[PDB]
Amino acid sequence: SERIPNNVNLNENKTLQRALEQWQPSFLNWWDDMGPENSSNYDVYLRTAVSVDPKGWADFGYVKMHDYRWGIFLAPQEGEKKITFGEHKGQDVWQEVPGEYRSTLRRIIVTQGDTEPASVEQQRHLGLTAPSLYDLRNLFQVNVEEGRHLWAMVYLLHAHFGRDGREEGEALLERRSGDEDNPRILTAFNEKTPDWLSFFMFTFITDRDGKFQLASLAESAFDPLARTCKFMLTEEAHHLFVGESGIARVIQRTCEVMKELGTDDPAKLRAAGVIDLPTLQKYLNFHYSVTSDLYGAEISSNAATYYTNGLKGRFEEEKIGDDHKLQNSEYEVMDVAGDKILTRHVPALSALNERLRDDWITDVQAGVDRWNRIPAKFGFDFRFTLPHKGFHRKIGMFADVHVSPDGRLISEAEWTHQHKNWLPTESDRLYVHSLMGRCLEPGKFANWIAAPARGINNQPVNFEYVRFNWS
Ligand SMILES: [Cl-]
Ligand SMILES: [Fe+3]
Ligand SMILES: [Fe+3]
Ligand SMILES: [O-]
């Protein structure tokens, strides 16, 4: 082992190596303060990336999380990679950041960076109510990887953004989720993640915004960014898995109990300590709509310049069958006109945020379809659905207006009186919270969630995924 593991020959740039070694103790201070509560002396069975070979790239073993081997890993550098979109299509990719784009790319990197520790800060208390050792370990695995994502971006800042990059790396540790004076940059990352149902939805829906922002940055003309993100997407895949199967196992458990009691009635299901499917639907509505705001205004001149200038491409840019310049292309978006929601066509360049939002909607929907297999398998009519994209939005054309899940423009009064049916109430949040009792004995699961289909790294489900050191 080296002090900072990496596949970018950090060793051979002494100035850069020392700058990051200077930042490391500060990162570790942040981990000890805002990382998982009371965990400094736990041994956790964790995956650690040591390399990038797709055949095997990650060690498994017990480690105390303070000692986790956070490292910098980029996808391998391609020979003569060309810029695939925008005014610079056809030219060589960039190894350094051009002056004209320096501050724009900095803000992109910093904003992506900021969401990483924000997630850990939002989730630091969750361990104390973990429904199983398996689940606690998953939480911790997500947490250390979000840590590594902070390292991924701070590396770029130090390596390619000089003085202010150094300053940005500091400031990334000084802002704090929900803080009054130094809050994190985006609204979704200052929200409470108050329980494990929210956590699974977060990693299912909001980490998915991560997926799509990263996939777009993975196309970037700025190739060190591109390569950082390509790898990060592999990590994000694990986070989405935790979320999707989290909720699946909760739905499984609720369905088991609906069959077992021969009933549908929320009151009865809640007497038995499960989360009724309609309440789950409200949580889906909440996280979905709040996350949708992160993609930005549907129509936006800034997104257009990030494409044209080669900074940020579309999701799976190279598969799309067009000119990859888009000056003469169109895209269909919605439009609020009077008391009706219509559609119209706009220049493709101005609707890139909406395209990426639409791509993310599709991906979330495929997951909702998979969840719906469960009640179908039980012969139940219940289906999860996604609300109309304008529902419960604070960013974009729907910001100053209200839309029901089924896509009706509704008055302020209707919203006030009906939204208790569509988003979690205090009562619903208190009920879900009341089920959150920790359960730490090997192979056992809190009554509100089912056992997973399998373990981790081929260990059995009743493996001792976390040792606390009493035993
Ligand atoms: Cl109104
Ligand atoms: Fe991340
Ligand atoms: Fe993530
Ligand atoms: O992530």
* Ligand 1 centroid to residue 190 C-alpha, Å: 28
Tokens of 419: 């939204």
> Residue 361: CB partners within 8 Å, gap ≥ 6?
292, 386, 389
Cβ neighbours, 10 Å, residue 251 = 24
Quick one: which ligand is closest to 152's CA? 2
CA angle (305 as vertex; 304, 309 as ends), nearest 5 = 125
The span from the CA of 298 to the CA of 409, in Å, is 18
Tokens of 15: 């100035």
* Ligand 3 centroid to residue 209 C-alpha, Å: 9
> Residue 120: CB partners within 8 Å, gap ≥ 6?
34, 35, 36, 143, 146, 147
* 420: helix, strand or coil: helix
The span from the CA of 343 to the CA of 89, in Å, is 31
* Ligand 1 centroid to residue 298 C-alpha, Å: 23
List, chain by chain if needed, residues with CB within 6 Å of any ligand 4 atom: 146, 149, 207, 210, 235-236, 239
The span from the CA of 105 to the CA of 251, in Å, is 41
Q: How was this structure determined?
A: X-ray
Tokens of 455: 């373990």
- 77 in Cβ contact with 227 (< 8 Å): yes
DSSP state at residue 94: B
* Ligand 4 centroid to residue 249 C-alpha, Å: 22
* Ligand 2 centroid to residue 423 C-alpha, Å: 26
The domain limits of the chain are: 1-471
Quick one: which ligand is closest to 416's CA? 1
- 343 in Cβ contact with 332 (< 8 Å): yes
DSSP state at residue 423: S
The span from the CA of 225 to the CA of 460, in Å, is 38
Q: Within 13 Å and on the Cβ side, how many CA atoms surround 15?
A: 6
* Ligand 4 centroid to residue 236 C-alpha, Å: 5
The span from the CA of 40 to the CA of 63, in Å, is 10
Residue 69: which of 53, 51, 48 has the closest Cα? Answer: 48
* 414: helix, strand or coil: helix
Nearest CA to ligand 4 atom 1: 236
> Residue 8: CB partners within 8 Å, gap ≥ 6?
72, 73, 74, 155
- 199 in Cβ contact with 126 (< 8 Å): yes
What are the angstrom distances between the C-alpha of 319 and each of 2, 208, 313, 322? Answer: 39, 20, 12, 9
The span from the CA of 114 to the CA of 173, in Å, is 9
Quick one: which ligand is closest to 115's CA? 2
* 271: helix, strand or coil: helix
Resolution value in angstroms: 2.5
The span from the CA of 166 to the CA of 19, in Å, is 8
Cβ neighbours, 10 Å, residue 382 = 19
Residue 35: which of 62, 65, 67, 61 has the closest Cα? Answer: 65
Which residues sit with Cβ closer than 5 angstroms to ligand 3, an ion?
207, 210, 239
* 359: helix, strand or coil: helix
* Ligand 2 centroid to residue 126 C-alpha, Å: 18
Choices 1.10.630.10, 1.10.150.120, 3.30.565.10, 1.10.620.20: CATH for 1-471: 1.10.620.20
Q: What single letter denotes the amino acid at residue 53?
A: D
